[PDB]
Amino acid sequence: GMNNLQVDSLRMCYESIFRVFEYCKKWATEFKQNYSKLHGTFIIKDTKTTNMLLRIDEFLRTTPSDLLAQRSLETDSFERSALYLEQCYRQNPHDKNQNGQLLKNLQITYEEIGDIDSLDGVLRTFATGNLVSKIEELQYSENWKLAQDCFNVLGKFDPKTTTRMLKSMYDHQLYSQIISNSSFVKEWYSIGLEAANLEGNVQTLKNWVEQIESLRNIDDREVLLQYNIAKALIAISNEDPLRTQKYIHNSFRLIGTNFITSSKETTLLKKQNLLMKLHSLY
């Protein structure tokens, strides 16, 4: 019935489960180097009984398929949102349909961490998809340009591929293009407005402001940051240092609430984007 509320309680139970799982790893590592110091790492009836006890506790591994369901909870925590999913595919299924359905989340695990070395190191290594998919995946590799060509013209000539268009294009950092691409649907705005600011023209960025603010009720977390970023850059080009402070402060109040996130969680070089627009703001 409940969604996030139920999931919070389930994650508290999974925190206790993780505590228990990590407990034995913390435990037996001490145990067997204590038994090795007593001349008998595993050469002891009690040591074997301890290993059997650990096996009994681990018997809540409980159908590694059920462990697959638990990984399928797909924790915001990337690390073991990998680990057991790793296990789920690692030795166990090697089954074409199981393998294919897992390949989806394997790419999402690489996306969770950030670094996508396995996009071509595992997915394209196993040739997941057709030639169209191969061409799209090839983009990050030293081939990115003509692929961008086609992946642009198709967007001209199926809107959901248009968002992928803007994403890859923007990913070539070529804001000086997307300013032109379709300046004359929603996910595209994050792409577009950024260029609309970055190129810096008091006339097109007026237009992007006009386009954004006309929307019903954005209510959305992404676009509002860049909107603040922009609606600052009317005053600077019109010389009112009072209000620019107000808008950039409101930029803080936004960035400091929603996009700002958990404490550490494995994220270092990918935080940059979020923190570095902040730096330049300053």
């Binding site: 030639l131 169209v132 086609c150």
Partner: protein, 146 residues
Amino acid sequence: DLSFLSSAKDKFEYKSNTTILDYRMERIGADFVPNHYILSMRKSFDQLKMNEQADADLGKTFFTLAQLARNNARLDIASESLMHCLERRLPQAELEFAEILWKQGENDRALKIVQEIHEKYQENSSVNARDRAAVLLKFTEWLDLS
């Protein structure tokens, strides 16, 4: 050829017209620029009519154009059209784009792909394979001089 192509409506006088233009194209001199312009004209000519006949040909046509385009260095239309021709999914609509990834300094990854394509061509599953033996030959001289 165009004014003809809007004077031949039936799929026999237009179909014959296809052979007519097919010979007509011979004289154009080996120079790319001309072939480019004429093929561009007939390609606009299709989608204008949206009927089965050149419906089932325009991708092959653009491909014919890209052939000259890359024997004299431009892949713009090659990729700008491969996607199109895959709706009609030629038996070359794969190996020659392999080839265009191949003419650049790129050889190796296109090579993994066309070794898969050499498996797919022993697995010819197709016509008597002389023309289709030429493509397997085409991958043959990848490794012939790798």
